[PDB]
Design a protein around this motif. Structure first.
Motif, PDB file in Angstrom:
ATOM      1  N   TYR A 181      38.386 -21.103  24.733  1.00  0.00           N
ATOM      2  CA  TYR A 181      37.820 -21.067  26.077  1.00  0.00           C
ATOM      3  C   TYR A 181      36.700 -22.089  26.248  1.00  0.00           C
ATOM      4  O   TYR A 181      35.734 -21.846  26.968  1.00  0.00           O
ATOM      5  N   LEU A 218      29.291 -25.312  17.496  1.00  0.00           N
ATOM      6  CA  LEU A 218      29.501 -23.968  18.029  1.00  0.00           C
ATOM      7  C   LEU A 218      30.036 -22.972  17.002  1.00  0.00           C
ATOM      8  O   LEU A 218      29.849 -21.768  17.188  1.00  0.00           O
ATOM      9  N   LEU A 239      29.104 -32.002  19.375  1.00  0.00           N
ATOM     10  CA  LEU A 239      28.754 -30.972  20.350  1.00  0.00           C
ATOM     11  C   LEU A 239      29.610 -29.727  20.174  1.00  0.00           C
ATOM     12  O   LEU A 239      29.125 -28.604  20.342  1.00  0.00           O
ATOM     13  N   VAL A 240      30.889 -29.905  19.849  1.00  0.00           N
ATOM     14  CA  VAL A 240      31.794 -28.779  19.648  1.00  0.00           C
ATOM     15  C   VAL A 240      31.707 -28.249  18.226  1.00  0.00           C
ATOM     16  O   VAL A 240      31.806 -27.043  18.005  1.00  0.00           O
ATOM     17  N   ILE A 256      36.369 -18.483  20.346  1.00  0.00           N
ATOM     18  CA  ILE A 256      35.420 -19.382  20.997  1.00  0.00           C
ATOM     19  C   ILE A 256      36.110 -20.678  21.411  1.00  0.00           C
ATOM     20  O   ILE A 256      35.971 -21.138  22.548  1.00  0.00           O
ATOM     21  N   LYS A 313      36.770 -28.758  26.682  1.00  0.00           N
ATOM     22  CA  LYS A 313      36.490 -30.073  26.126  1.00  0.00           C
ATOM     23  C   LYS A 313      37.725 -30.572  25.396  1.00  0.00           C
ATOM     24  O   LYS A 313      38.532 -29.782  24.908  1.00  0.00           O
ATOM     25  N   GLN A 329      29.543 -38.515  18.258  1.00  0.00           N
ATOM     26  CA  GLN A 329      28.551 -37.821  19.072  1.00  0.00           C
ATOM     27  C   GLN A 329      29.211 -36.781  19.968  1.00  0.00           C
ATOM     28  O   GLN A 329      28.653 -35.705  20.200  1.00  0.00           O
TER      29      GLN A 329
END
Lengths: 46, 55, 110, 102
Positions: C38, C23, C19-20, C35, C41, C15
RNA sequence: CGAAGGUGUGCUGUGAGGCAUGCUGGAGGUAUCAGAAGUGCGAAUGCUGACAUAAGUAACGAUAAAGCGGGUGAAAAGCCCGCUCGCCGGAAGACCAAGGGUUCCUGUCCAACGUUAAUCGGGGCAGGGUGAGUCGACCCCUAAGGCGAGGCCGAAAGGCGU
RNA sequence: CCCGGCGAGGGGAGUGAAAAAGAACCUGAAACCGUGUACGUACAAGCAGUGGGAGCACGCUUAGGCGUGUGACUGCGUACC
């Protein structure tokens, strides 16, 4: 808070040792039972 | 206080519909060294707005 | 031509890694690296290493060009869990799960 | 006693080397033998700095089941079976096709 | 020239069911007519294993407290060195008995353990370290009490005592 | 041989009948968790199905039909032991 187990080697050996078991007829029955089951440790004596 | 019925995966997703991350819009370019950096921050070599600050 | 790279048994929750992963799905590789550099996480470091491995594989084993590559697929799956014990009040014990993930990245010139 | 011994000449009965000939090099206690030039394998060998040995891909013989080979009879040019008998006071082997001592 | 088992599709009987075949698998299956049963599961706050929910929510264990420069390193709020600050001081200092048994010192590693990171550790692996006529134990002497040649008593087992 | 911390992990080359037989290794079911495609869904009130029924996508085709997926709108309808 003080708990139940409070160790002492002299008391341990005088209570449950090999010679104490041998000194009475019922202790020998304990030893015979444990030999028949096949335990690796027979008493508490080192 | 606890639930009386087990919630569904559909509800799990509806709640998580607000959890996505946002990326940085763009980077800046220093006028002397040509490096990319976060706006209003110094570069990794030690430049800011064309001048060397940290050696 | 597609090229794969993987990180199996990674120390993280799926999970949290998704999230990453969301992107950089479908971007060019240079933009994706910019991306990831920077993003504050922990999963970003792991994903970045996997992407770099995929690019190097495409250069060495398949003869690809860096300027033409895109992140064509990416996904995260769940792995085995470790089980641990944590004591609580009045002599009651609870279980703790330590979760892991597998990370897969696919680059392509199309 | 044993029907196949070291330094014998044999012919292969079964496997990818069916029909080839060679000499027995040594006998193992599990029921297998090493024959010269038969049953070759390629081993990926890691280098070891001690002993001044480098790595490489090597070709070497592997063991084959003893019941998969036969004693060769030069007089007939064919495979044969073995029997035992006493001649003077000692035990000897003999070919079963012609009854001649080995 | 592809058995059982697994997963789809077509057809078929009033039902429990049956027949054919594509993909996976890699060595077994069993007509017909009779014979014997550990013979059919959704519930028993049933028994064993695996996996969900609440949720990326509560919490991270005394409110004695930290700041900055240099070093090493892939990475330093927490490790090493330096200068300031703060806390205990009839103790939160020093030495022992009881209990534990290598946790002690040096080199090397960071998967798991450490409620966070870790180059650090009472963690992993290897090597080293405990030197007595005078310190203790063993030894000589007995207290409470224990065992007890013969002895008294008690169906047996045993009890009390010189 | 290559990316990486002289890591963990992975991509090639090579062995073998077979490597989704690679040591967390015969076969590899279900609960549970993801990525991609088609269709529906932001003025609408309840055991979530059943009877009727447009529209869209797709495969055959005797160009007439038909099959398969989804399903706006509407009658009736308060789980099991």
């Amino acid at each position: 808070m003080k708990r139940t187990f409070q160790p002492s080697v002299l008391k341990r050996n005088r209570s449950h040792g090999f010679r104490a078991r041998m000194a009475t007829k019922n202790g020998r029955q304990v030893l015979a039972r444990r030999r028949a089951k096949g335990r690796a440790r027979l008493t508490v004596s080192k | 206080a606890v639930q009386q019925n087990k919630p569904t995966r559909s509800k799990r997703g509806m709640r998580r519909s607000h959890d996505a991350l946002t990326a940085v819009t763009s980077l800046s370019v220093d006028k002397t060294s040509g490096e990319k950096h976060l706006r209003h921050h110094i570069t990794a070599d030690g430049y800011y707005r064309g001048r060397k600050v940290i050696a | 031509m597609e090229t794969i790279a993987k990180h199996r048994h990674a120390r993280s929750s799926a999970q949290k890694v998704r999230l990453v992963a969301d992107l950089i799905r479908g971007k060019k590789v240079s933009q994706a690296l910019d991306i990831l550099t920077y993003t504050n996480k922990k999963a970003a470091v792991l994903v970045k290493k996997v992407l770099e491995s995929a690019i190097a594989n495409a250069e060495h084993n398949d003869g690809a060009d860096i300027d033409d590559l895109k992140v064509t697929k990416i996904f995260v799956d769940e792995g085995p869990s470790m089980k641990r014990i944590m004591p609580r009040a009045k002599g009651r014990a609870d279980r703790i799960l330590k979760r892991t993930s597998h990370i897969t990245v696919v680059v392509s010139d199309r | 006693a044993a029907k196949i011994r070291r330094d014998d000449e044999v012919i292969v009965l079964t496997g990818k080397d069916k029909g080839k000939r060679g000499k027995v090099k040594n006998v193992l206690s599990s029921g297998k033998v090493i024959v010269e030039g038969i049953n070759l394998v390629k081993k990926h060998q890691k280098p070891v700095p001690a002993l001044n040995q480098p790595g490489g891909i090597v070709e070497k013989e592997a063991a084959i089941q003893v019941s998969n080979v036969a004693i060769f009879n030069a007089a007939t040019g064919k495979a044969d079976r073995v029997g035992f008998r006493f001649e003077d006071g000692k035990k000897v082997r003999f070919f079963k096709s012609n009854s001649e001592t080995i």
